[PDB]
Amino acid sequence: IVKEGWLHKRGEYITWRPRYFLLKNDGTFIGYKERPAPLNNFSVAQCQLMKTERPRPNTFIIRCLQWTTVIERTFHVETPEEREEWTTAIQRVTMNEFEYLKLLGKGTFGKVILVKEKATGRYYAMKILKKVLQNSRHPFLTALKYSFQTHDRLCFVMEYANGGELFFHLSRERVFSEDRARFYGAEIVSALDYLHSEKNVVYRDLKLENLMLDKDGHIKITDFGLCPEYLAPEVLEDNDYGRAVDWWGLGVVMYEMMCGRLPFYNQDHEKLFELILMEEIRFPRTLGPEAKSLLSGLLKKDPKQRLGGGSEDAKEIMQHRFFAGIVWQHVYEKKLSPPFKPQVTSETDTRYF
Numbered sequence: 001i002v003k004e005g006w007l008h009k010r011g012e013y014i015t016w017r018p019r020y021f022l023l024k025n026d027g028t029f030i031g032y033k034e035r036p037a038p039l040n041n042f043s044v045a046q047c048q049l050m051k052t053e054r055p056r057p058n059t060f061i062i063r064c065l066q067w068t069t070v071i072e073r074t075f076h077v078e079t080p081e082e083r084e085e086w087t088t089a090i091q092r093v094t095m096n097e098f099e100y101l102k103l104l105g106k107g108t109f110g111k112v113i114l115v116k117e118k119a120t121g122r123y124y125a126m127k128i129l130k131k132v133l134q135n136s137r138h139p140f141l142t143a144l145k146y147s148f149q150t151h152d153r154l155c156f157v158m159e160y161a162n163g164g165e166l167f168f169h170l171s172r173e174r175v176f177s178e179d180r181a182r183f184y185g186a187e188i189v190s191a192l193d194y195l196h197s198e199k200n201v202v203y204r205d206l207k208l209e210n211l212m213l214d215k216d217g218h219i220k221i222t223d224f225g226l227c228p229e230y231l232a233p234e235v236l237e238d239n240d241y242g243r244a245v246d247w248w249g250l251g252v253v254m255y256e257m258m259c260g261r262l263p264f265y266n267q268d269h270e271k272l273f274e275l276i277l278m279e280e281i282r283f284p285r286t287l288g289p290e291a292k293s294l295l296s297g298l299l300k301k302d303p304k305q306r307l308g309g310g311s312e313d314a315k316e317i318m319q320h321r322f323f324a325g326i327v328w329q330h331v332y333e334k335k336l337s338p339p340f341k342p343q344v345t346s347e348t349d350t351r352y353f
C-alpha cells in the first residue's frame with residue numbers, strides 16, 4: 001500500500017460518490033464503498049494523468065490503453081495539494097496494405113473498419129484510435145494480427161469472424177435449445193476462464209452483441225470497444241467488482257438463449273435498474289431444472305454468493321450439473337461439434353458481411 005484515503009469518483013454508468021481508494025505497489029488502484037486476486041483492469045501501469053478543473057476544480061483523470069481499448073476513470077479531491085499528493089503517488093505494415101470496406105463501429109476514441117488485406121484477400125477488423133503485446137493462446141478470444149501507428153492514429157488489425165453475429169442467428173430462430181446454449185456457454189466459459197487466470201483480466205462486456213460465430217460455427221468474443229439490460233448489480237451501485245461480473249453476464253446471455261427473451265426488461269432505464277437490483281427472476285416453466293439452477297446461480301445479485309464468484313472462479317461453473325460430461329481440454333482445442341454451421345464456404349465468404 002503506497003497511499004490510501006477517500007476520493008470522489010464519477011459514476012461510470014447511472015454521478016459523484018465518495019469511495020475509499022487503495023493504491024498499491026502492484027499497480028492496482030481500487031475503491032471500496034467503506035474503508036475495507038489482482039486484476040489488470042484496475043492497474044495504473046502505463047496510464048496517463050491529467051489535472052483539470054472541469055467540471056469541478058481539483059479534478060483529475062487517469063487514462064489508460066488496456067490492450068486495444070481506451071479506459072478512463074475520473075476523480076476529484078478537495079484541494080490542489082491533495083490532488084498533487086495522489087498524482088505524484090500514482091506516477092512492418094501500413095494503411096496502404098488494406099482495403100476499407102464497411103464501418104463496423106464509430107465512437108469517441110476512434111473507429112472500427114471492415115478491411116481486406118491486399119496481399120492475401122483475407123478479411124480483418126481494423127481499430128483506429130485517434131491520439132510490447134503477446135496474444136492469448138486461446139481460440140475464442142479475438143487475436144491481434146498487426147499493431148502499427150501513424151502520426152495521429154493508433155491502428156490494430158484483429159480477427160473478424162465471418163459466420164454472423166450470434167444476436168442475429170438468435171433473432172432468426174427466436175430461441176436456442178438447451179444443448180446449443182450449452183455449446184456456446186462452454187466456449188464462453190473456457191474463454192473467460194483463460195482471461196481470468198492466465199491474464200488476470202475481466203472482460204466486463206459479455207453480451208449478445210459481443211459474440212459472433214466463425215466459419216465453423218465456433219464462438220468468437222469481440223474486442224471492438226470504442227466508447228444496461230446486462231449490467232451487474234454490483235456495477236450499477238458502483239462498487240468494487242471483479243471476475244464475477246462476467247458470470248452475471250454469462251447468465252444474462254444464457255438466459256436469453258434458452259428463454260428467447262431478457263431476464264429483466266423495461267423501457268425506462270431507471271425502472272430497469274430498479275429491477276436489476278430488486279426483482280428476483282421468474283424463470284419459465286418450459287425449462288430444464290439443471291438450466292434453472294445454472295441461471296439462478298449465475299444471476300445471484302451478490303457477487304460473493306454468485307456461481308463462479310468464489311476463489312475457484314470458473315472451476316465452479318465448469319463442474320455444474322448443466323455442464324456434465326464436457327471435456328474442458330476438448331473445448332479449448334475446439335473439439336466440440338458445433339450444432340450450427342453458418343452458410344459459409346471459405347474464411348472469405350462475404351455472405352455474412
Ligand SMILES: Nc1ncccc1-c1nc2ccc(-c3ccccc3)nc2n1-c1ccc(C2(N)CCC2)cc1
Nearest residue numbers: 040041066067069141142201203204205221222223225
Ligand atoms: N483480445 C480479446 N478478445 C476477446 C475478449 C477479450 C480480449 C482481451 N484480451 C486482453 C488482453 C489484455 C487486456 C488487458 C485488460 C486490462 C489491462 C491490461 C490489458 N484485455 C484484454 N481483452 C479485453 C478486451 C476488451 C475488454 C473490454 N470489453 C473493453 C473494456 C472491457 C476487456 C478485456
